[PDB]
């Protein structure tokens, strides 16, 4: 639910998806990539007041009942997507799928 | 990996698995579980000096304007087997994603 549809419409201070465009040559020094020239990688950022996994719900409950709280949550990636690229070995084209390059959704963990 | 084997007897300040024992009745208010009385839930915590996090770390050095800074969070989760009663009939259940097994900087 903390995806582009929800986040990229109203700039919110709390956790959720943030737009980020990365140029391979300029931003990463990956000069060998023929296609694409860059991509919408995005990132996750913002305050976590907001309980995806059973373990996250357990910790959240424990932190209120035990006098000594454990960890506090932070904004991180939930769903990721690969990115397909094109490079050349001499004149031979090579297509590669790079897993987990794009962040589609965020969560407080 | 950032797991019990690496982290537990090597207490350092960077991102690591940390021990946390939780008592069901005392800490959660879950009075229905018969066995076990508690379990090692653990958690992830510490400083952070996937391909997306590795590209973000590279972008943050090359671009003059850095984006997000990494978080210490749960990587792998494990189920916990419990025993409870529905009346006087025993019921074993595997409760999904109850334990954190390893951590990551993301």
């Amino acid at each position, epitope marked *: 639910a903390l995806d582009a549809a929800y986040c990229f419409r109203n*700039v*919110q*201070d709390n956790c959720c998806l*943030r*737009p*980020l*465009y990365i*140029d391979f040559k*300029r931003d990463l020094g990956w000069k060998w990539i023929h296609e694409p020239k*860059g991509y919408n990688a995005n*990132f996750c*950022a*913002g*305050a976590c007041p907001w309980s995806d996994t059973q373990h996250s719900r357990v910790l959240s409950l424990y932190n209120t009942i035990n006098p000594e709280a454990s960890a506090s949550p932070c904004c991180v990636s939930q769903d990721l997507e690969p990115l397909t690229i094109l490079y050349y070995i001499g004149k031979t084209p090579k297509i590669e799928q790079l897993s987990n390059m794009i962040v589609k959704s965020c969560k407080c963990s | 990996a950032l797991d019990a084997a690496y982290c537990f007897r090597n207490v350092q300040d960077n991102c690591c698995l940390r021990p946390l024992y939780i008592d069901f009745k005392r800490d959660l208010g879950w009075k229905w579980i018969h066995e076990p009385k508690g379990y090692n839930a653990n958690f992830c915590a510490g400083a952070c000096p996937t391909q997306h996090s590795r590209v973000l770390s590279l972008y*943050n*050095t*090359i*671009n*003059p*304007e*850095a*984006s*997000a*800074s990494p978080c210490c969070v749960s990587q792998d989760l494990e189920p916990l087997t419990i025993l409870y009663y529905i009346g006087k009939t025993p019921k074993i259940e595997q409760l999904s994603n109850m334990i954190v097994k390893s951590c990551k900087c993301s």
Partner: antibody, heavy 124, light 113 residues
Framework: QQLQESGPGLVKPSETLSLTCTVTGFSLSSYTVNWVRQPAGKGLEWIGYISYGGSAYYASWANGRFTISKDSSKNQVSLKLSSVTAADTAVYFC???????????????????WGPGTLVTVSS | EAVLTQSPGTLSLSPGERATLSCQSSQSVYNNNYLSWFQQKPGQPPRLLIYGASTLTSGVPDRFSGSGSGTDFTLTISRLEPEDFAVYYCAGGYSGSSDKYAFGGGTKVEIKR
């Protein structure tokens, strides 16, 4: 559209300096905020920033003495400087990156707007 | 790390004359265009003039222009107005784990007599 720095007029040597930059008209989740100091009779010196995304970067001369952070809910950017010497006497400005972070086009080393500046004197 | 050298230290000119201020970076700025110019008057914060080496900020008179790429940059004031006598600074943007930005030492544009 506005930035205002606040701090103590004086600090005694060895103590820790705390400065605030109160922001108005723009979100800290959208813009990078920088600290820039100017010793008397000297030029502008970039200290560091807290990025629109939450990353803090510093000049190599900072030597870990500076901490720049933010609290979006309070519209505040903070500067903490430890083990203060006479060499830290200066006007301290907070300066916003001209444009929002993250797009294919950045701010191109432009800072706009700037706050009026706060004078910090380090003396016993 | 990166050092911006502004020359000359002082430029003495009369109102109406052309002013050219140089800024040279030790390493190429990020994307060869991460370079901005600022004007500073006494008791005031710096004022943004030009960004991305050559783009004039809104409300800045057309007599100001910027040029250059990589390491060598110039700010030109076509015909100096009395309000243009001030200190001018260049700022560069860089790759790195520190020193993301740096300012040059500044050039004073002084009234000739």
């Amino acid at each position: 559209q506005q930035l205002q720095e606040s701090g103590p007029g004086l600090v005694k040597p060895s103590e820790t300096l705390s400065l605030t930059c109160t922001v108005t008209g723009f979100s800290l989740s959208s813009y990078t905020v920088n600290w820039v100091r100017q010793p008397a009779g000297k030029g502008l010196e970039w200290i560091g920033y807290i990025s629109y995304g939450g990353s803090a970067y510093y000049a190599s001369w900072a030597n870990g003495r500076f901490t720049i952070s933010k609290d979006s809910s309070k519209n505040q950017v903070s500067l903490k400087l430890s083990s203060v010497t006479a060499a830290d006497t200066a006007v301290y400005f907070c300066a916003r990156h001209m444009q929002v972070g993250g797009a294919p086009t950045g701010s191109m080393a432009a800072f706009d707007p700037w706050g009026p500046g706060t004078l910090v004197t380090v003396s016993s | 790390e990166a050092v911006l050298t502004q020359s000359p230290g002082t430029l003495s000119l009369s109102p109406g004359e052309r002013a050219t201020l140089s800024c040279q970076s030790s390493q190429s700025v990020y994307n060869n265009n991460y370079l901005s110019w600022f004007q500073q008057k006494p008791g005031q914060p710096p004022r943004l003039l030009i960004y991305g080496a050559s783009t004039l900020t809104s409300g800045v008179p057309d007599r100001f222009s910027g040029s250059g790429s990589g390491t060598d940059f110039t700010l030109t004031i076509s015909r100096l107005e009395p309000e243009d006598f001030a200190v001018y600074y260049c700022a560069g943007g860089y790759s790195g784990s520190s020193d993301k930005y740096a300012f040059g030492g500044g050039t004073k544009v002084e009234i000739k007599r």
